[PDB]
Amino acid sequence: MQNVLIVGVGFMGGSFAKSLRRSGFKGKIYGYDINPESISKAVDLGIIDEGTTSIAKVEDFSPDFVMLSSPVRTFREIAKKLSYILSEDATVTDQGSVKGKLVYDLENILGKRFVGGHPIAGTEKSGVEYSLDNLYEGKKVILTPTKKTDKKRLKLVKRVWEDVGGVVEYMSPELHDYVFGVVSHLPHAVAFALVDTLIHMSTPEVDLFKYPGGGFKDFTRIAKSDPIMWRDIFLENKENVMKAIEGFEKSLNHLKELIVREAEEELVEYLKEVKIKR
Amino acid sequence: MQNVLIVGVGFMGGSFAKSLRRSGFKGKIYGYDINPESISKAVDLGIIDEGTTSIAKVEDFSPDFVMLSSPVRTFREIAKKLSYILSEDATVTDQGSVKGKLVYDLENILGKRFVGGHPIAGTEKSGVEYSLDNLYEGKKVILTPTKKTDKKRLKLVKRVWEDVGGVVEYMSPELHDYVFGVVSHLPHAVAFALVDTLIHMSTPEVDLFKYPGGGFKDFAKSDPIMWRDIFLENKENVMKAIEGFEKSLNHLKELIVREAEEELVEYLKEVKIKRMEI
Numbered sequence: 001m002q003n004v005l006i007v008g009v010g011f012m013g014g015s016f017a018k019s020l021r022r023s024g025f026k027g028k029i030y031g032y033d034i035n036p037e038s039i040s041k042a043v044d045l046g047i048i049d050e051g052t053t054s055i056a057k058v059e060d061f062s063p064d065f066v067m068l069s070s071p072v073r074t075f076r077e078i079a080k081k082l083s084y085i086l087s088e089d090a091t092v093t094d095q096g097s098v099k100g101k102l103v104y105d106l107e108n109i110l111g112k113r114f115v116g117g118h119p120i121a122g123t124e125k126s127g128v129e130y131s132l133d134n135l136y137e138g139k140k141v142i143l144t145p146t147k148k149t150d151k152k153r154l155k156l157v158k159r160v161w162e163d164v165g166g167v168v169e170y171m172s173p174e175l176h177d178y179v180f181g182v183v184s185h186l187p188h189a190v191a192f193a194l195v196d197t198l199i200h201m202s203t204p205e206v207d208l209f210k211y212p213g214g215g216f217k218d219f220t221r222i223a224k225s226d227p228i229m230w231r232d233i234f235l236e237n238k239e240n241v242m243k244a245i246e247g248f249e250k251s252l253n254h255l256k257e258l259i260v261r262e263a264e265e266e267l268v269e270y271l272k273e274v275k276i277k278r
Numbered sequence: 279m280q281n282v283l284i285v286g287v288g289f290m291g292g293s294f295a296k297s298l299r300r301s302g303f304k305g306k307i308y309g310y311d312i313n314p315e316s317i318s319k320a321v322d323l324g325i326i327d328e329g330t331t332s333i334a335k336v337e338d339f340s341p342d343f344v345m346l347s348s349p350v351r352t353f354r355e356i357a358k359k360l361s362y363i364l365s366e367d368a369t370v371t372d373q374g375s376v377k378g379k380l381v382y383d384l385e386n387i388l389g390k391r392f393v394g395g396h397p398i399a400g401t402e403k404s405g406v407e408y409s410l411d412n413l414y415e416g417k418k419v420i421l422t423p424t425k426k427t428d429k430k431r432l433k434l435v436k437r438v439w440e441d442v443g444g445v446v447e448y449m450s451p452e453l454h455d456y457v458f459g460v461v462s463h464l465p466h467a468v469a470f471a472l473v474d475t476l477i478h479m480s481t482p483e484v485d486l487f488k489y490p491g492g493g494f495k496d497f498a499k500s501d502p503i504m505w506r507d508i509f510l511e512n513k514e515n516v517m518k519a520i521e522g523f524e525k526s527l528n529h530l531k532e533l534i535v536r537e538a539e540e541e542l543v544e545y546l547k548e549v550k551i552k553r554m555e556i
């Protein structure tokens with residue numbers, strides 16, 4: 001591994017390249033992006049050594065390790081092109097926020113080269129300009145092996161993520177989507193809706209946006225995330241997202257009934273759930 | 279003003295007391311609390327000059343300025359006792375998180391002496407041992423005067439808060455509970471529900487609490503008892519807020535169910551802009 005290729009040189013792609021370099025990688029870091037400015041900026045910042053917007057020129061880089069960091073919706077089309085360009089011994093992995101069937105689709109396109117991944121490290125910022133060289137430190141990184149996953153490549157990807165500080169753990173592609181549908185997608189949905197609530201509950205008399213405190217702002221900081229990306233995530237993992245919103249509403253409606261009936265003792269018990277050493 | 283009585287010598291009661299001294303107060307600061315330890319520690323810490331665990335004893339302090347800093351549930355019971363202990367020349371104000379009906383009930387019991395208040399500060403900490411002498415510096419303070427409110431007492435209480443760095447503004451008792459019912463209570467109710475959700479959506483193959491980096495960390499250190507009281511005291515507004523919230527969340531859910539790709543991005547874009555302007 002001496003030629004790494006960053007596909008999609010934005011916040012995540014750039015953060016991975018910076019982290020890899022800072023961890024001591026001495027090989028070449030190349031970039032591929034459809035946006036010319038992305039490539040230019042990354043080269044200026046020293047995030048990548050060289051880049052291009054022409055997929056065909058990538059063969060000139062002879063990549064042995066590819067990190068898919070563009071929007072998930074672009075993976076399949078990009079993977080098909082890489083299948084003709086990349087040597088069979090190369091390794092291709094990703095940072096996509098969703099896994100599920102995507103993983104099997106990429107395996108069918110790329111064969112043994114593919115290893116699905118998702119670093120649990122977020123941001124509300126976009127673009128390579130905001131890239132960080134320690135973004136993954138202490139953050140979990142979910143790799144999603146399947147029966148067909150290549151043992152050696154999985155081990156390699158794990159080591160690379162550990163080299164940048166990730167806390168690697170494995171989940172099937174399906175389990176990943178369920179888990180994060182509840183622990184990440186649902187919370188984001190709740191944050192978006194909480195902000196939307198203040199829009200509708202404000203009156204020509206009072207503008208609720210004038211009174212948000214810390215509890216409110218902390219809970220809604222993720223509502224500043226990229227709209228296009230979350231529109232994508234919500235649709236890409238819609239089955240689990242629908243189930244998670246439904247489950248949440250079941251819990252909220254239970255709290256609601258406790259409040260309406262003024263069930264003092266049970267209400268306290270419900271609220272005490274927020275304790276637990278876990 | 280010269281005989282200050284802190285009712286409920288905890289984090290808030292203690293903070294007001296300390297904020298009082300730093301501001302240059304040279305008079306006497308007394309305390310009343312049902313807990314012996316609260317008084318003893320407060321005295322050693324130089325928080326208060328002297329205190330008692332017997333409400334009757336208060337007359338020995340002949341307080342002319344009282345700051346209710348105990349649980350809101352205790353206000354009505356304490357006020358009734360104070361009505362025949364305090365002289366008609368005394369001023370009584372509070373720190374309760376809720377106003378609304380509480381303000382009118384306190385006025386009916388204490389008369390022209392009562393002035394409702396709510397400092398928007400305090401990191402939820404509990405115990406006079408955590409009180410600070412700057413907790414209000416720059417923070418907002420909501421006073422809820424009514425038609426029966428005494429202009430002289432209102433101005434007094436206002437100046438005092440400002441003397442401890444507070445930024446005062448006025449709201450009717452009902453508007454206060456509506457606003458905070460949506461911007462504070464609802465957000466907390468939502469978090470309690472999220473916790474219940476992770477508990478019930480966890481399965482034998484996964485403990486959802488092990489993954490807080492996906493946005494769940496935003497959502498605690500709260501007090502189950504305090505919130506049980508707040509949810510009871512502000513039941514109507516909290517119920518309306520939850521219903522308002524579910525309308526926003528269901529609108530979002532629907533955009534996902536039918537995959538309205540463009541409308542979803544617009545929904546998220548608007549919320550992002552609104553959250554940024556906060």
Ligand SMILES: NC(=O)c1ccc[n+]([C@@H]2O[C@H](COP(=O)([O-])OP(=O)(O)OC[C@H]3O[C@@H](n4cnc5c(N)ncnc54)[C@H](O)[C@@H]3O)[C@@H](O)[C@H]2O)c1
Pocket residue numbers: 007008009010011012013032033034035038069070071072074078095096097098119120121122123124125126127128229
């Ligand atoms: N934003 C986050 O916090 C976060 C966290 C975990 C995972 N992810 C995942 O990683 C992806 C990227 O996130 P980001 O924040 O870096 O986005 P970004 O907008 O900062 O960067 C995305 C890059 O993708 C490029 N791109 C778009 N289409 C392309 C194509 N067809 N070929 C090559 N490049 C293309 C863009 O030009 C841009 O430089 C997301 O799609 C998401 O699934 C994001």
Ligand SMILES: NC(=O)c1ccc[n+]([C@@H]2O[C@H](COP(=O)([O-])OP(=O)(O)OC[C@H]3O[C@@H](n4cnc5c(N)ncnc54)[C@H](O)[C@@H]3O)[C@@H](O)[C@H]2O)c1
Pocket residue numbers: 285286287288289290291310311312313316347348349350352356373374375376397398399400401402403404405406
């Ligand atoms: N905690 C916060 O961040 C915060 C913020 C704004 C307003 N408030 C309000 O301030 C008040 C106190 O908050 P805190 O955080 O200091 O709580 P705390 O637990 O630190 O202190 C409460 C005190 O009340 C005493 N107490 C209980 N019953 C009493 C009674 N019948 N008579 C006299 N004392 C009694 C306790 O012994 C304790 O010392 C509450 O009414 C709350 O609504 C709290």
